[PDB]
């Protein structure tokens, strides 16, 4: 079964430039489980990234969470880039702090 | 309230890249507490919740020996299934399993379950009676027959009814401060303009626990369930969850809509307006 | 406490 991943990027608390926070990238509803997830700050890969909350729903599709700590600024941009065999090219989703 | 102990097992073959990847993830309610990954530098069952530090070294040694055993068992399964389905040794294939038990407030057993899937499709599952099996296809029928003659349901039932139940009660006790807490949501609404004099009102519910919560939008007292966008509740990285629900409304008619938040950590529901 | 002895398919 081949299902295309849904990428959701959000923070733990409402953004406040200068206060520490947690940035999350939730990748859901995909199959096969082969997947590459990357988090970026200004185009560079963030090294300290934790993977957790792995599971699967009733229809057996996979769920996985990627997260890292971060202190927002008004000039830094964040994004989550995902590679999965259901897509021709890697998908990048930028964090929308005004959502 | 009800509480559950669940284990999500996944075995994925990867021809030409060596042995299959094998993972086991354990959960007590909506909380990840243990994990095992065969691709790890040093594969061992490791704790994922601070309260698990109360378990001695013999616990981790037992769980690790067990997992390595499960890993070999599943490598065989990946070979067998290729036979059952007349498939080639060149493709990647996946087996998934969920096993668990749920208890009520008094700690008595509510139910137990174990389900298998191959390549994202139902394969075989234990029935509610915890005595018989049900197969999704011809191949699963072969396994059903093997398992009936070997008497597997009786061994499994002993686990779901006893071991699973007793250990679940222990986890809730040792980790009650974490597992029996209640974090109340903090909500707010955002406004976004659209073409044709309309707007998108979004209601956010943040940092709550447990994960169960109800977010609704209302107009004239009627809960606008049909015309409302919503996301599945999701973990926020620190053990809590978040969720949002939006509604597009006529420009200047915003105040006529309200957001209601129901959660076990709220004596009275929250009602928001932009 | 994880289950073991997963029967072979």
mmCIF file of C-alpha atoms in Angstrom:
data_model
loop_
_atom_site.group_PDB
_atom_site.id
_atom_site.type_symbol
_atom_site.label_atom_id
_atom_site.label_comp_id
_atom_site.label_asym_id
_atom_site.label_seq_id
_atom_site.Cartn_x
_atom_site.Cartn_y
_atom_site.Cartn_z
ATOM 1 C CA UNK A 1 0.000 0.000 0.000
ATOM 2 C CA UNK A 2 1.353 3.428 -1.005
ATOM 3 C CA UNK A 3 0.093 6.511 0.847
ATOM 4 C CA UNK A 4 1.450 10.051 0.493
ATOM 5 C CA UNK A 5 2.635 11.708 3.756
ATOM 6 C CA UNK A 6 0.923 14.739 5.274
ATOM 7 C CA UNK A 7 3.441 17.218 6.707
ATOM 8 C CA UNK A 8 2.418 19.542 9.542
ATOM 9 C CA UNK A 9 4.882 22.054 10.999
ATOM 10 C CA UNK A 10 4.088 23.879 14.267
ATOM 11 C CA UNK A 11 5.495 25.055 17.599
ATOM 12 C CA UNK A 12 4.657 24.092 21.197
ATOM 13 C CA UNK A 13 3.981 27.686 22.316
ATOM 14 C CA UNK A 14 2.893 30.774 20.331
ATOM 15 C CA UNK A 15 6.114 32.306 18.911
ATOM 16 C CA UNK A 16 7.845 34.963 21.015
ATOM 17 C CA UNK A 17 11.138 36.163 19.577
ATOM 18 C CA UNK A 18 13.738 35.483 22.236
ATOM 19 C CA UNK A 19 11.890 32.898 24.325
ATOM 20 C CA UNK A 20 12.845 29.206 23.918
ATOM 21 C CA UNK A 21 10.284 26.961 22.218
ATOM 22 C CA UNK A 22 9.908 23.534 20.537
ATOM 23 C CA UNK A 23 9.475 23.114 16.783
ATOM 24 C CA UNK A 24 7.598 20.032 15.554
ATOM 25 C CA UNK A 25 7.209 18.334 12.200
ATOM 26 C CA UNK A 26 4.462 15.720 12.285
ATOM 27 C CA UNK A 27 4.486 13.360 9.298
ATOM 28 C CA UNK A 28 1.295 11.327 9.030
ATOM 29 C CA UNK A 29 -0.592 8.757 6.941
ATOM 30 C CA UNK A 30 2.121 7.236 4.792
ATOM 31 C CA UNK A 31 3.096 3.781 3.574
ATOM 32 C CA UNK A 32 5.646 2.199 3.052
ATOM 33 C CA UNK A 33 7.498 3.205 6.264
ATOM 34 C CA UNK A 34 10.648 4.149 4.316
ATOM 35 C CA UNK A 35 11.002 7.916 4.867
ATOM 36 C CA UNK A 36 13.646 10.651 5.270
ATOM 37 C CA UNK A 37 12.777 13.686 7.410
ATOM 38 C CA UNK A 38 14.933 16.788 7.825
ATOM 39 C CA UNK A 39 14.418 20.006 9.739
ATOM 40 C CA UNK A 40 16.108 23.189 8.542
ATOM 41 C CA UNK A 41 17.033 26.607 9.856
ATOM 42 C CA UNK A 42 17.907 29.059 7.082
ATOM 43 C CA UNK A 43 18.550 26.238 4.625
ATOM 44 C CA UNK A 44 20.921 24.370 6.915
ATOM 45 C CA UNK A 45 20.116 21.019 8.497
ATOM 46 C CA UNK A 46 19.492 21.045 12.241
ATOM 47 C CA UNK A 47 21.596 18.313 13.945
ATOM 48 C CA UNK A 48 19.899 17.987 17.349
ATOM 49 C CA UNK A 49 16.574 16.560 16.151
ATOM 50 C CA UNK A 50 14.604 13.951 18.095
ATOM 51 C CA UNK A 51 12.298 11.388 16.477
ATOM 52 C CA UNK A 52 9.409 10.078 18.583
ATOM 53 C CA UNK A 53 5.719 9.145 18.890
ATOM 54 C CA UNK A 54 5.918 6.500 16.177
ATOM 55 C CA UNK A 55 2.701 4.559 15.620
ATOM 56 C CA UNK A 56 0.111 3.659 12.981
ATOM 57 C CA UNK A 57 -3.623 4.243 12.660
ATOM 58 C CA UNK A 58 -6.596 1.930 12.037
ATOM 59 C CA UNK A 59 -5.834 1.797 8.317
ATOM 60 C CA UNK A 60 -2.244 0.841 9.199
ATOM 61 C CA UNK A 61 -0.663 4.055 7.831
ATOM 62 C CA UNK A 62 2.387 5.366 9.727
ATOM 63 C CA UNK A 63 2.702 8.404 12.031
ATOM 64 C CA UNK A 64 6.014 9.890 13.221
ATOM 65 C CA UNK A 65 7.091 13.036 15.048
ATOM 66 C CA UNK A 66 10.322 15.011 14.625
ATOM 67 C CA UNK A 67 11.117 17.818 17.072
ATOM 68 C CA UNK A 68 13.866 20.140 18.252
ATOM 69 C CA UNK A 69 14.193 23.117 20.607
ATOM 70 C CA UNK A 70 14.468 26.649 19.240
ATOM 71 C CA UNK A 71 14.290 30.333 20.142
ATOM 72 C CA UNK A 72 12.522 32.261 17.352
ATOM 73 C CA UNK A 73 13.830 35.494 15.846
ATOM 74 C CA UNK A 74 12.100 37.789 13.354
ATOM 75 C CA UNK A 75 14.591 36.941 10.570
ATOM 76 C CA UNK A 76 15.137 33.163 10.844
ATOM 77 C CA UNK A 77 13.049 30.789 8.740
ATOM 78 C CA UNK A 78 12.307 27.141 9.528
ATOM 79 C CA UNK A 79 11.101 24.267 7.389
ATOM 80 C CA UNK A 80 10.724 20.502 7.272
ATOM 81 C CA UNK A 81 11.899 18.630 4.150
ATOM 82 C CA UNK A 82 10.551 15.103 3.529
ATOM 83 C CA UNK A 83 11.513 12.396 1.018
ATOM 84 C CA UNK A 84 9.141 9.480 0.406
ATOM 85 C CA UNK A 85 8.666 7.020 -2.482
ATOM 86 C CA UNK A 86 5.225 8.458 -3.202
ATOM 87 C CA UNK A 87 6.694 11.763 -4.389
ATOM 88 C CA UNK A 88 8.872 12.609 -7.400
ATOM 89 C CA UNK A 89 10.795 15.281 -5.513
ATOM 90 C CA UNK A 90 11.359 16.036 -1.796
ATOM 91 C CA UNK A 91 8.652 18.239 -0.288
ATOM 92 C CA UNK A 92 9.590 21.270 1.854
ATOM 93 C CA UNK A 93 7.028 22.772 4.228
ATOM 94 C CA UNK A 94 7.840 26.133 5.830
ATOM 95 C CA UNK A 95 6.789 27.012 9.346
ATOM 96 C CA UNK A 96 3.934 29.533 9.267
ATOM 97 C CA UNK A 97 4.179 31.557 12.473
ATOM 98 C CA UNK A 98 1.012 33.517 11.665
ATOM 99 C CA UNK A 99 -1.312 30.495 11.274
ATOM 100 C CA UNK B 1 -10.874 6.263 33.467
ATOM 101 C CA UNK B 2 -9.786 3.513 31.027
ATOM 102 C CA UNK B 3 -6.083 2.827 30.607
ATOM 103 C CA UNK B 4 -4.218 0.743 28.060
ATOM 104 C CA UNK B 5 -0.868 -0.928 27.462
ATOM 105 C CA UNK B 6 -0.058 -1.243 23.741
ATOM 106 C CA UNK B 7 2.910 -2.438 21.680
ATOM 107 C CA UNK B 8 3.365 -1.479 18.017
ATOM 108 C CA UNK B 9 5.672 -3.899 16.196
ATOM 109 C CA UNK B 10 6.946 -3.374 12.657
ATOM 110 C CA UNK B 11 9.192 -5.597 10.539
ATOM 111 C CA UNK B 12 10.340 -4.235 7.171
ATOM 112 C CA UNK B 13 12.427 -6.227 4.697
ATOM 113 C CA UNK B 14 14.992 -4.413 2.555
ATOM 114 C CA UNK B 15 16.521 -6.694 -0.120
ATOM 115 C CA UNK B 16 20.149 -5.951 -0.955
ATOM 116 C CA UNK B 17 20.552 -3.845 2.194
ATOM 117 C CA UNK B 18 20.906 -6.653 4.735
ATOM 118 C CA UNK B 19 18.592 -7.901 7.491
ATOM 119 C CA UNK B 20 15.075 -6.431 7.925
ATOM 120 C CA UNK B 21 14.595 -3.402 10.158
ATOM 121 C CA UNK B 22 12.784 -4.349 13.365
ATOM 122 C CA UNK B 23 11.101 -1.939 15.797
ATOM 123 C CA UNK B 24 8.941 -2.263 18.918
ATOM 124 C CA UNK B 25 7.300 0.781 20.532
ATOM 125 C CA UNK B 26 5.370 0.606 23.814
ATOM 126 C CA UNK B 27 2.668 2.979 25.063
ATOM 127 C CA UNK B 28 0.759 3.404 28.327
ATOM 128 C CA UNK B 29 -2.224 5.533 27.239
ATOM 129 C CA UNK B 30 -0.975 8.318 24.935
ATOM 130 C CA UNK B 31 2.531 8.102 26.388
ATOM 131 C CA UNK B 32 5.547 6.464 24.700
ATOM 132 C CA UNK B 33 7.420 4.693 27.514
ATOM 133 C CA UNK B 34 9.713 2.073 25.904
ATOM 134 C CA UNK B 35 11.327 1.453 22.514
ATOM 135 C CA UNK B 36 13.560 -1.027 20.631
ATOM 136 C CA UNK B 37 15.215 -0.387 17.238
ATOM 137 C CA UNK B 38 17.403 -2.960 15.458
ATOM 138 C CA UNK B 39 19.174 -0.274 13.422
ATOM 139 C CA UNK B 40 20.444 1.284 16.645
ATOM 140 C CA UNK B 41 24.211 1.225 17.277
ATOM 141 C CA UNK B 42 23.585 -0.935 20.326
ATOM 142 C CA UNK B 43 20.096 -2.542 20.087
ATOM 143 C CA UNK B 44 18.549 -2.728 23.557
ATOM 144 C CA UNK B 45 15.071 -1.993 24.904
ATOM 145 C CA UNK B 46 15.394 1.539 26.261
ATOM 146 C CA UNK B 47 13.195 3.754 28.511
ATOM 147 C CA UNK B 48 11.396 6.766 27.009
ATOM 148 C CA UNK B 49 9.636 8.043 30.116
ATOM 149 C CA UNK B 50 11.492 9.204 33.206
ATOM 150 C CA UNK B 51 9.333 7.111 35.545
ATOM 151 C CA UNK B 52 10.733 3.925 34.008
ATOM 152 C CA UNK B 53 13.954 4.504 35.995
ATOM 153 C CA UNK B 54 12.273 2.536 38.802
ATOM 154 C CA UNK B 55 12.864 -0.727 36.936
ATOM 155 C CA UNK B 56 15.964 -2.717 37.821
ATOM 156 C CA UNK B 57 18.603 -3.899 35.348
ATOM 157 C CA UNK B 58 17.023 -7.368 35.135
ATOM 158 C CA UNK B 59 13.976 -5.739 33.534
ATOM 159 C CA UNK B 60 15.958 -4.311 30.623
ATOM 160 C CA UNK B 61 17.915 -7.526 30.201
ATOM 161 C CA UNK B 62 14.708 -9.543 29.960
ATOM 162 C CA UNK B 63 12.986 -7.152 27.543
ATOM 163 C CA UNK B 64 16.090 -7.038 25.312
ATOM 164 C CA UNK B 65 16.446 -10.827 25.138
ATOM 165 C CA UNK B 66 12.758 -11.005 24.318
ATOM 166 C CA UNK B 67 12.988 -8.435 21.489
ATOM 167 C CA UNK B 68 15.955 -10.106 19.806
ATOM 168 C CA UNK B 69 13.899 -13.296 19.852
ATOM 169 C CA UNK B 70 10.961 -11.492 18.252
ATOM 170 C CA UNK B 71 13.293 -10.095 15.580
ATOM 171 C CA UNK B 72 14.394 -13.539 14.408
ATOM 172 C CA UNK B 73 10.809 -14.819 14.518
ATOM 173 C CA UNK B 74 9.722 -12.030 12.132
ATOM 174 C CA UNK B 75 12.581 -12.565 9.670
ATOM 175 C CA UNK B 76 11.118 -16.035 9.159
ATOM 176 C CA UNK B 77 7.621 -14.561 8.734
ATOM 177 C CA UNK B 78 8.854 -12.304 5.934
ATOM 178 C CA UNK B 79 10.154 -15.387 4.122
ATOM 179 C CA UNK B 80 6.974 -17.411 4.685
ATOM 180 C CA UNK B 81 4.651 -14.672 3.440
ATOM 181 C CA UNK B 82 6.560 -14.517 0.126
ATOM 182 C CA UNK B 83 5.657 -18.180 -0.304
ATOM 183 C CA UNK B 84 1.993 -17.732 0.627
ATOM 184 C CA UNK B 85 1.597 -14.916 -1.895
ATOM 185 C CA UNK B 86 3.919 -16.238 -4.623
ATOM 186 C CA UNK B 87 6.055 -13.084 -4.434
ATOM 187 C CA UNK B 88 9.705 -12.556 -5.349
ATOM 188 C CA UNK B 89 12.712 -12.155 -3.048
ATOM 189 C CA UNK B 90 13.464 -8.763 -4.569
ATOM 190 C CA UNK B 91 10.808 -6.466 -3.132
ATOM 191 C CA UNK B 92 10.447 -4.717 0.224
ATOM 192 C CA UNK B 93 7.565 -5.922 2.410
ATOM 193 C CA UNK B 94 6.057 -4.937 5.761
ATOM 194 C CA UNK B 95 4.417 -6.758 8.685
ATOM 195 C CA UNK B 96 2.723 -4.679 11.427
ATOM 196 C CA UNK B 97 1.228 -5.861 14.742
ATOM 197 C CA UNK B 98 -0.697 -4.220 17.614
ATOM 198 C CA UNK B 99 -1.228 -6.044 20.918
ATOM 199 C CA UNK B 100 -2.727 -4.710 24.111
ATOM 200 C CA UNK B 101 -5.089 -4.715 27.058
ATOM 201 C CA UNK B 102 -7.369 -2.019 28.502
ATOM 202 C CA UNK B 103 -8.507 -1.652 32.118
ATOM 203 C CA UNK B 104 -11.122 0.505 33.832
ATOM 204 C CA UNK B 105 -10.830 2.848 36.829
ATOM 205 C CA UNK B 106 -10.936 -0.107 39.245
ATOM 206 C CA UNK B 107 -8.162 -1.897 37.369
ATOM 207 C CA UNK B 108 -10.207 -4.782 36.026
ATOM 208 C CA UNK B 109 -9.826 -5.945 32.411
ATOM 209 C CA UNK B 110 -12.061 -4.375 29.766
ATOM 210 C CA UNK B 111 -10.614 -6.132 26.700
ATOM 211 C CA UNK B 112 -7.534 -7.517 24.958
ATOM 212 C CA UNK B 113 -6.488 -7.575 21.297
ATOM 213 C CA UNK B 114 -3.832 -8.550 18.739
ATOM 214 C CA UNK B 115 -3.925 -7.747 15.022
ATOM 215 C CA UNK B 116 -1.613 -8.425 12.100
ATOM 216 C CA UNK B 117 -1.292 -6.687 8.733
ATOM 217 C CA UNK B 118 0.848 -7.402 5.653
ATOM 218 C CA UNK B 119 1.797 -4.552 3.313
ATOM 219 C CA UNK B 120 -0.771 -2.284 4.962
ATOM 220 C CA UNK B 121 -3.655 -4.737 4.722
ATOM 221 C CA UNK B 122 -5.441 -6.754 7.385
ATOM 222 C CA UNK B 123 -4.108 -10.279 7.690
ATOM 223 C CA UNK B 124 -5.399 -12.084 10.821
ATOM 224 C CA UNK B 125 -6.882 -10.863 14.109
ATOM 225 C CA UNK B 126 -7.905 -12.254 17.479
ATOM 226 C CA UNK B 127 -11.659 -12.156 18.008
ATOM 227 C CA UNK B 128 -13.320 -10.469 20.973
ATOM 228 C CA UNK B 129 -13.860 -13.823 22.705
ATOM 229 C CA UNK B 130 -10.067 -14.062 22.881
ATOM 230 C CA UNK B 131 -10.445 -17.666 21.756
ATOM 231 C CA UNK B 132 -10.815 -17.664 17.980
ATOM 232 C CA UNK B 133 -9.098 -16.044 14.998
ATOM 233 C CA UNK B 134 -10.427 -14.353 11.869
ATOM 234 C CA UNK B 135 -8.511 -14.281 8.580
ATOM 235 C CA UNK B 136 -8.737 -11.600 5.918
ATOM 236 C CA UNK B 137 -7.700 -13.848 3.008
ATOM 237 C CA UNK B 138 -6.658 -17.265 1.679
ATOM 238 C CA UNK B 139 -3.101 -16.964 3.039
ATOM 239 C CA UNK B 140 -4.264 -15.960 6.524
ATOM 240 C CA UNK B 141 -6.424 -19.100 6.453
ATOM 241 C CA UNK B 142 -3.252 -21.200 6.390
ATOM 242 C CA UNK B 143 -1.933 -19.417 9.504
ATOM 243 C CA UNK B 144 -5.353 -19.678 11.218
ATOM 244 C CA UNK B 145 -5.275 -23.443 10.783
ATOM 245 C CA UNK B 146 -1.655 -23.748 12.042
ATOM 246 C CA UNK B 147 -2.477 -21.625 15.098
ATOM 247 C CA UNK B 148 -5.610 -23.611 15.945
ATOM 248 C CA UNK B 149 -3.754 -26.928 16.016
ATOM 249 C CA UNK B 150 -0.871 -25.535 18.081
ATOM 250 C CA UNK B 151 -3.204 -23.832 20.554
ATOM 251 C CA UNK B 152 -1.758 -20.337 20.322
ATOM 252 C CA UNK B 153 -4.875 -18.431 21.446
ATOM 253 C CA UNK B 154 -4.663 -20.011 24.913
ATOM 254 C CA UNK B 155 -1.081 -18.858 25.443
ATOM 255 C CA UNK B 156 -1.817 -15.370 24.120
ATOM 256 C CA UNK B 157 -4.983 -15.126 26.237
ATOM 257 C CA UNK B 158 -2.925 -15.914 29.349
ATOM 258 C CA UNK B 159 -0.831 -12.846 28.553
ATOM 259 C CA UNK B 160 -3.600 -10.353 27.683
ATOM 260 C CA UNK B 161 -5.612 -11.347 30.739
ATOM 261 C CA UNK B 162 -2.811 -11.679 33.252
ATOM 262 C CA UNK B 163 0.671 -10.369 32.539
ATOM 263 C CA UNK B 164 -0.538 -7.402 30.457
ATOM 264 C CA UNK B 165 -3.093 -6.408 33.118
ATOM 265 C CA UNK B 166 -0.775 -6.745 36.135
ATOM 266 C CA UNK B 167 2.101 -4.849 34.525
ATOM 267 C CA UNK B 168 -0.257 -2.091 33.354
ATOM 268 C CA UNK B 169 -1.416 -1.554 36.947
ATOM 269 C CA UNK B 170 2.211 -1.337 38.033
ATOM 270 C CA UNK B 171 3.114 1.276 35.394
ATOM 271 C CA UNK B 172 0.172 3.502 36.371
ATOM 272 C CA UNK B 173 1.302 3.315 39.983
ATOM 273 C CA UNK B 174 5.029 3.996 39.459
ATOM 274 C CA UNK B 175 4.232 6.740 36.970
ATOM 275 C CA UNK B 176 0.957 8.136 38.351
ATOM 276 C CA UNK B 177 2.340 11.671 38.619
ATOM 277 C CA UNK B 178 2.808 11.647 34.862
ATOM 278 C CA UNK B 179 0.062 9.269 33.714
ATOM 279 C CA UNK B 180 -2.652 10.471 36.085
ATOM 280 C CA UNK B 181 -2.126 14.228 35.680
ATOM 281 C CA UNK B 182 -4.465 16.569 33.810
ATOM 282 C CA UNK B 183 -3.259 19.602 31.863
ATOM 283 C CA UNK B 184 -5.934 22.132 30.933
ATOM 284 C CA UNK B 185 -5.940 23.563 27.377
ATOM 285 C CA UNK B 186 -5.129 27.213 26.621
ATOM 286 C CA UNK B 187 -7.126 28.484 23.655
ATOM 287 C CA UNK B 188 -7.085 31.428 21.223
ATOM 288 C CA UNK B 189 -8.518 32.427 17.822
ATOM 289 C CA UNK B 190 -6.783 33.777 14.691
ATOM 290 C CA UNK B 191 -8.209 35.796 11.756
ATOM 291 C CA UNK B 192 -7.225 35.415 8.083
ATOM 292 C CA UNK B 193 -8.774 37.301 5.160
ATOM 293 C CA UNK B 194 -9.860 35.651 1.896
ATOM 294 C CA UNK B 195 -11.303 36.768 -1.463
ATOM 295 C CA UNK B 196 -15.040 37.476 -1.887
ATOM 296 C CA UNK B 197 -15.410 39.217 1.508
ATOM 297 C CA UNK B 198 -14.874 36.123 3.662
ATOM 298 C CA UNK B 199 -12.509 35.141 6.456
ATOM 299 C CA UNK B 200 -10.992 32.052 8.061
ATOM 300 C CA UNK B 201 -11.449 31.893 11.837
ATOM 301 C CA UNK B 202 -9.195 29.315 13.489
ATOM 302 C CA UNK B 203 -9.549 28.155 17.064
ATOM 303 C CA UNK B 204 -6.468 26.691 18.746
ATOM 304 C CA UNK B 205 -6.318 24.481 21.845
ATOM 305 C CA UNK B 206 -2.784 24.112 23.276
ATOM 306 C CA UNK B 207 -0.733 22.153 25.782
ATOM 307 C CA UNK B 208 -3.391 19.809 27.164
ATOM 308 C CA UNK B 209 -3.391 16.233 28.523
ATOM 309 C CA UNK B 210 -4.857 13.612 28.099
ATOM 310 C CA UNK B 211 -5.170 13.830 24.323
ATOM 311 C CA UNK B 212 -8.976 13.489 24.261
ATOM 312 C CA UNK B 213 -10.722 16.807 23.692
ATOM 313 C CA UNK B 214 -13.682 18.296 21.826
ATOM 314 C CA UNK B 215 -13.378 21.538 19.832
ATOM 315 C CA UNK B 216 -16.524 22.935 18.187
ATOM 316 C CA UNK B 217 -17.640 26.097 16.400
ATOM 317 C CA UNK B 218 -21.127 27.469 17.007
ATOM 318 C CA UNK B 219 -23.642 29.830 15.427
ATOM 319 C CA UNK B 220 -27.160 30.376 16.824
ATOM 320 C CA UNK B 221 -26.331 27.672 19.364
ATOM 321 C CA UNK B 222 -26.058 25.087 16.585
ATOM 322 C CA UNK B 223 -22.701 23.308 16.464
ATOM 323 C CA UNK B 224 -21.543 23.829 12.861
ATOM 324 C CA UNK B 225 -20.108 20.331 12.381
ATOM 325 C CA UNK B 226 -20.575 20.094 8.588
ATOM 326 C CA UNK B 227 -18.841 23.327 7.606
ATOM 327 C CA UNK B 228 -15.744 23.138 9.799
ATOM 328 C CA UNK B 229 -12.105 22.223 9.110
ATOM 329 C CA UNK B 230 -10.229 20.180 11.713
ATOM 330 C CA UNK B 231 -6.857 18.462 12.320
ATOM 331 C CA UNK B 232 -6.194 15.230 14.212
ATOM 332 C CA UNK B 233 -4.927 15.782 17.754
ATOM 333 C CA UNK B 234 -1.129 15.772 17.714
ATOM 334 C CA UNK B 235 1.841 15.602 20.146
ATOM 335 C CA UNK B 236 3.699 18.874 20.690
ATOM 336 C CA UNK B 237 7.091 17.476 21.722
ATOM 337 C CA UNK B 238 6.869 17.779 25.498
ATOM 338 C CA UNK B 239 4.220 15.221 26.382
ATOM 339 C CA UNK B 240 1.198 17.420 25.673
ATOM 340 C CA UNK B 241 -1.072 17.796 22.639
ATOM 341 C CA UNK B 242 -2.588 20.522 20.460
ATOM 342 C CA UNK B 243 -5.437 20.872 17.944
ATOM 343 C CA UNK B 244 -7.271 23.465 15.836
ATOM 344 C CA UNK B 245 -10.608 23.874 14.043
ATOM 345 C CA UNK B 246 -11.499 26.578 11.523
ATOM 346 C CA UNK B 247 -14.584 28.079 9.909
ATOM 347 C CA UNK B 248 -14.968 30.487 6.961
ATOM 348 C CA UNK B 249 -17.460 33.260 7.741
ATOM 349 C CA UNK B 250 -18.979 36.330 5.985
ATOM 350 C CA UNK B 251 -16.831 39.454 6.453
ATOM 351 C CA UNK B 252 -18.026 41.498 9.412
ATOM 352 C CA UNK B 253 -20.110 38.614 10.781
ATOM 353 C CA UNK B 254 -17.256 37.227 12.912
ATOM 354 C CA UNK B 255 -18.738 38.009 16.363
ATOM 355 C CA UNK B 256 -21.721 35.775 15.542
ATOM 356 C CA UNK B 257 -19.496 32.697 15.924
ATOM 357 C CA UNK B 258 -17.973 31.122 19.045
ATOM 358 C CA UNK B 259 -15.526 28.326 19.818
ATOM 359 C CA UNK B 260 -16.193 25.810 22.597
ATOM 360 C CA UNK B 261 -13.514 23.715 24.254
ATOM 361 C CA UNK B 262 -14.430 20.609 26.282
ATOM 362 C CA UNK B 263 -11.711 18.691 28.158
ATOM 363 C CA UNK B 264 -11.554 16.727 31.416
ATOM 364 C CA UNK B 265 -9.289 19.451 32.808
ATOM 365 C CA UNK B 266 -11.978 22.100 32.467
ATOM 366 C CA UNK B 267 -14.722 22.349 35.156
ATOM 367 C CA UNK B 268 -16.719 24.433 32.690
ATOM 368 C CA UNK B 269 -16.052 24.618 28.906
ATOM 369 C CA UNK B 270 -14.157 27.523 27.371
ATOM 370 C CA UNK B 271 -16.090 29.783 25.018
ATOM 371 C CA UNK B 272 -14.071 32.028 22.721
ATOM 372 C CA UNK B 273 -14.919 34.773 20.268
ATOM 373 C CA UNK B 274 -12.441 36.707 18.122
ATOM 374 C CA UNK C 1 5.987 -5.730 29.636
ATOM 375 C CA UNK C 2 6.154 -6.796 25.995
ATOM 376 C CA UNK C 3 4.764 -10.063 24.643
ATOM 377 C CA UNK C 4 7.196 -12.713 23.430
ATOM 378 C CA UNK C 5 6.880 -16.109 21.760
ATOM 379 C CA UNK C 6 5.114 -14.506 18.776
ATOM 380 C CA UNK C 7 3.933 -17.607 16.870
ATOM 381 C CA UNK C 8 5.315 -18.031 13.344
ATOM 382 C CA UNK C 9 2.838 -17.371 10.521
#
